[PDB]
């Protein structure tokens, strides 16, 4: 099951983002697109999609058959479109690309009260997930709030990181 995480990591800018995956490092604060198909060869670390609650997406081929090649082959992809809620609610995903840039996908915000791109439910709030501080280092001082809500019939329990 670990073979299904993309591990194409290349710290070409000596920022040390890969080191946070393997060693305990607190975050420094000196510095502080449609969800279709992403090629796994450009991905480093886990791929999270946020159907209200966060879900981990593993490497598959184009049919959706799970592969175990660490995302190294060109056929390995991430089928983000399959994770969309059937009822048409808010949807988004995020991951780290090979050179340490946080990438996001999602519908364009139809208003200040509408959702964001990745795990941004609110312009001020962020869906909490185990790799939040790795992809979003500046949200460390954000406050957590337990959220219960029904969307399309399904109850979703998750936490939101707000200012």
């Amino acid at each position: 099951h670990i073979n299904r995480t993309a591990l194409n990591c290349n710290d070409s800018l000596q920022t040390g983002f890969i080191t946070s995956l393997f060693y305990a490092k607190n975050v420094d604060s000196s510095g502080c697109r449609p969800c279709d198909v992403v090629s796994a060869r450009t991905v480093c670390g886990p791929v999270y999609c946020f159907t209200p609650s966060p879900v981990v997406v593993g490497t598959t081929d184009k049919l959706g058959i799970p592969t175990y090649n660490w995302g190294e082959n060109e056929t390995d992809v991430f089928m983000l479109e399959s994770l969309r809620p059937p009822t048409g609610g808010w949807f988004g995903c995020t991951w780290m690309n090979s050179t340490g840039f946080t990438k996001t996908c999602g519908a364009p915000p139809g208003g200040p009260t509408d959702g964001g791109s990745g795990p941004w439910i609110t312009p001020r709030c962020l869906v909490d997930y185990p790799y939040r501080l790795w992809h979003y280092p500046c949200t460390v001082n954000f406050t957590l709030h337990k959220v219960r809500m029904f969307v399309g019939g399904i109850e979703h329990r998750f936490d939101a990181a707000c200012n």
Partner: antibody
Framework: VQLVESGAEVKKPGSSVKVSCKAS????????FSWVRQAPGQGPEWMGG????????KYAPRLQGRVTITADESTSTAYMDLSSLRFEDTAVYYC???????????????????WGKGTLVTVSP | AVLTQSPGTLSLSPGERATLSCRAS???????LAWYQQKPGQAPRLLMY???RRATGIPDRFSGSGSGTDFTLTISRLEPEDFAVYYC?????????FGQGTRLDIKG
Amino acid sequence: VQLVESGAEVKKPGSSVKVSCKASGATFSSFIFSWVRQAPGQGPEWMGGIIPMFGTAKYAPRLQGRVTITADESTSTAYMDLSSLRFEDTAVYYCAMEVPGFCRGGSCSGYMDVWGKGTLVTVSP
Amino acid sequence: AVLTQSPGTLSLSPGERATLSCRASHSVSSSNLAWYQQKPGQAPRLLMYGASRRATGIPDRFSGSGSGTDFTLTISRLEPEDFAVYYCQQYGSSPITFGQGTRLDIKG
């Protein structure tokens, strides 16, 4: 983070030897162990590496067939086993904390931050 | 990627400026090159990573630069503790390699 190793050993030509490294100060499962040896009056030579939670172990091509590197998650102790010892294998054997610069297919490569104190292994009759 | 260091032995006086060079048989991707100091009977101490990023605890006098196939370690003013052997190490290719070392000793 500190890395303690097994004591010095003396072996005969053709025998084998097992060096252990205990990592304290960091989680063992995600630790990147690197084994680097250095013959007297020579430069360091990378032997192989192991990341336990990935299960994959990479080896240097020079002695890819004579070394097996294992990690024991129960006791937090990584092991390096070198078999069919030769006189040219007399060296100090270090374990180290590899800090990754790039990763591919279950393994990573980088620089050595925390070095073990060193384990002398002499091959003599 | 084979690393060749120059000079084999570098002889300088305390207070002088030391420049050690590491040359690679092929280009080192993303300047993945580190530098180590080794005093006799000790394990190598990491000085520099990413060609130019100084390791924590390393004094200001240690400086690194270069890219491609030509890397430089610079000690602006030599202190007595700085006479030792220096190794470079590339981590730009899948089997990492070390240089053969440069001995930095006292000029006479």
